[PDB]
Design a protein around this ligand. Sequence first.
Ligand SMILES: O=P(O)(O)O[C@@H]1[C@@H](O)[C@H](O)[C@H](O)[C@H](O)[C@H]1OP(=O)(O)O
Ligand SMILES: [Ca+2]
Ligand SMILES: [Ca+2]
Length: 513
Amino acid sequence: EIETFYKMLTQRAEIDRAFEEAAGSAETLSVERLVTFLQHQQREEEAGPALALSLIERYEPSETAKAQRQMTKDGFLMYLLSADGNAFSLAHRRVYQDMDQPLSHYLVSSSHNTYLLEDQLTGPSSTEAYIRALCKGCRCLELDCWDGPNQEPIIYHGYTFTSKILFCDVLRAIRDYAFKASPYPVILSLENHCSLEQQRVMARHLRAILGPILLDQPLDGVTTSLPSPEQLKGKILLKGKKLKLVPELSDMIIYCKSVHFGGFSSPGTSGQAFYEMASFSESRALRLLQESGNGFVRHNVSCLSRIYPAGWRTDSSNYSPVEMWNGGCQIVALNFQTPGPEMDVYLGCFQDNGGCGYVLKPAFLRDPNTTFNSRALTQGPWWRPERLRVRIISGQQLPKVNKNKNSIVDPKVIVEIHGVGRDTGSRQTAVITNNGFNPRWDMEFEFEVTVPDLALVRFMVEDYDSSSKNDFIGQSTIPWNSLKQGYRHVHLLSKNGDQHPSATLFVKISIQD
Ligand SMILES: O=P(O)(O)O[C@@H]1[C@@H](O)[C@H](O)[C@H](O)[C@H](O)[C@H]1OP(=O)(O)O
Ligand SMILES: [Ca+2]
Ligand SMILES: [Ca+2]
């Protein structure tokens, strides 16, 4: 009984079967079989006794089997729940890409009106908001500066009733957290509304507070392109207008001069200097993407574009970043304080590359001479269809999505493909009523994706309500190239992007060309 219970509360058939199938009849998995599993199933490339051994060394609970270079079912399970059994590639969870190209070549995690904790009209601002962002990996932050009492510049939403905070205070927080999450450059987007006096003050605080972190002079060399995240490692750069504007400030804008969108210079040689940056609202961006997809892309190859939520999003709601990333846009600004699929995809995207905040664009988005246009797809390197088959097997300890009572969850799972439009798909499972502890669905979906290099796969679990909406329970977004194959567990996240210790989905992923 009491064993039978812990034994029976804790008894997952899917796992048994999986171990069975792997080990065949043996009560154990020999390296020879482990490796077969690692290869045939988990489709690992580095599959080999080396891997298999580290797996066992790392996960095998039995001192015997461990010592005897073997894996018992338990050890199998643990691996499966480990950072190694995770659907989101462990390898990709550390900086592993080329940090040498000019910034324009990377997608940069960017925040919008960062100082805000809520809505854009009357919610509050706080330095906490910049801390959070920074802790969530954000590299590019926004400071809307306005003159304040006692000659001290303040930051708040120009023309609204949003609460205020000090320019200096913000500067310290940034100073303190700019690199907690990553060594790479942080970009400060100044939106100056300050009298010349207070402007200078600003300039003082910057120098005073950022000190040496501040990048106040062009990098020796750095002549034809933007520096690389490597070159700027440890610095913070300013972005704003460059010569109503005191030189103290303007003299600090080195590689990020705000500019009004000129146009894309294919019908010429140049347009915006690599050191010039344009911003575009959601709407405009779409339009240009709709009309000049290839223009933009090519543009974005050597220039940084910043996009920002549409004016009507007074609720700090966000738009989808994918659409812009698809155009090579790199400083895709979102309202970091707002839970939703948009931040889910955003943060999923940036978990890649050890979440350093910079993610190398695919090559075809880094070739000045590119005919790509996610909107008018033609054959190109980017064109590389794959067939994804995802099996939603079971759920484990799905969290009680609050609810002001003792009810049980009634879960269902949605899997979605995000990328070029042609590739967008969504599918959902059935609801298992009244089970969150160990719902088992065993449902499989299949998707065709022509442009994996821009895709992301999202797993979301809602608690079904016949009556009401459908309570979000947890979610997880994995970029296509970090999607791991075989049996894996998807570690679910709360709406706020926090890790849910024991909430997981157990799945079988298979990708074939
Ligand atoms: O920092 P930029 O690139 O200028 O973009 C900002 C944007 O991120 C946000 O403040 C919008 O509310 C605002 O309308 C816009 O400024 P705007 O008044 O120039 O449109
Ligand atoms: Ca702003
Ligand atoms: Ca129920």
